[PDB]
Design a protein around this ligand. Structure first.
Ligand SMILES: CCCCCCCC[P@@H](=O)OC[C@@H](COCCCC)OCCCC
Length: 311
């Protein structure tokens, strides 16, 4: 397939830019990582995760961040977002970032299963090595934001658990922060001009032809009727997928989702493009955005502690 070849060549271009950026970019200081843990009994290299920590721990456990990377469901691995994960860790958080098998080798159901396996691994083994699972920030960027938004709903719903073939994990998400998410991919082939066929191709690979996945491919289809944690929507008017952020706010309002936003206006400049705060941790706006996210997380964690007579 020439379409698959075309999709892959666009990601190999993205991969070259990612490689060059990383060669140059400053690396956050004072962090330790532990790499390449298998989260299940398999030799698939995507079924692995990294853990990150401040080099000096203020306590034995630290509030938890779990990151789902982006890349259009076709690209990336547990290393793609390492500088971002390191940044967040450097601020006194214990951080897990996972790989998941890529399209077209799997479909959405296999990617959701991988993510849940990484979450289940962490419920078993995280606390003994520093993860406070009472305070959990789930975050994802772009396709990773899609995935995070679905995982959040699936975690709350026995029906979706059964449909996606996963079990709930023994912790809750305190906050879900989506960074330039593409949470309504069904909307992609609309406009997209001469790219509609490619966008339709993404959707077919995500669904694997399973009509139940087709009917559950969008945040708008999985949100219905659930009591969810709060969300934070991060991005800006210069995100190539800003329309997806606009569309998601409409779904939030219609479903009484509690949320806050950190949306950069066009006036804040042409550099604030898609996933800028993940790809460029050291920029002042990335710092601001990411600290704001962590502050929002801390505020909710403190309210939870007060509510639970545990302040
Ligand atoms: C034809 C319609 C395809 C829909 C692609 C969905 C990409 C969302 P995101 O993971 O990636 C964000 C951004 C890339 O951001 C930089 C790399 C992020 C890992 O956009 C990808 C553009 C290539 C098609």
């Amino acid at each position: 397939e020439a379409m698959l070849a075309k999709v892959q060549a666009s990601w190999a271009q993205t991969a070259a830019r990612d490689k060059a950026r990383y060669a140059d970019e400053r690396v956050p200081e004072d962090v330790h990582w532990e790499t390449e843990y298998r989260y299940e009994q398999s030799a698939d290299p995507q079924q692995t995760l990294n853990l990150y920590y401040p080099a000096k721990r203020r306590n034995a456990t630290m509030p938890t961040v779990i990151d789902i990377h982006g890349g259009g469901w076709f690209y990336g691995d547990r290393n793609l977002n390492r500088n971002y994960c390191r940044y967040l860790a450097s601020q006194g958080y214990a951080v897990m970032g996972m790989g998941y098998r890529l399209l077209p080798d799997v479909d959405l159901r296999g990617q959701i299963q991988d993510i849940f396996a990484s979450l289940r691994w962490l419920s078993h083994f995280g606390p003994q090595r520093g993860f406070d699972l009472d305070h959990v920030l789930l975050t994802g960027d772009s396709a990773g934001g899609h995935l995070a938004s679905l995982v959040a709903c699936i975690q709350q719903s026995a029906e979706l658990q059964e449909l996606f073939g996963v079990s709930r994990v023994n912790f809750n998400f305190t906050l879900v922060a989506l960074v330039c998410p593409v949470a309504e991919p069904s909307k992609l082939p609309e406009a997209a001009g001469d790219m509609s066929d490619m966008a339709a191709f993404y959707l077919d690979k995500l669904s694997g032809g399973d009509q139940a996945l087709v009917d559950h491919l969008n945040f708008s289809q999985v949100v219905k009727g659930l009591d969810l944690p709060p969300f934070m929507l991060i991005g800006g008017q210069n995100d190539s997928f800003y329309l997806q952020s606009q569309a998601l706010l409409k779904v939030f309002d219609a479903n009484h989702v509690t949320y806050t936003t950190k949306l950069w206006p066009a006036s804040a400049g042409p550099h604030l493009k898609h996933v800028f705060n993940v790809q460029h941790w050291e920029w002042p706006e990335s710092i601001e955005t990411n600290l704001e996210m962590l502050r929002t997380f801390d505020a909710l964690s403190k309210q939870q502690d007060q509510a639970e007579e545990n302040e």
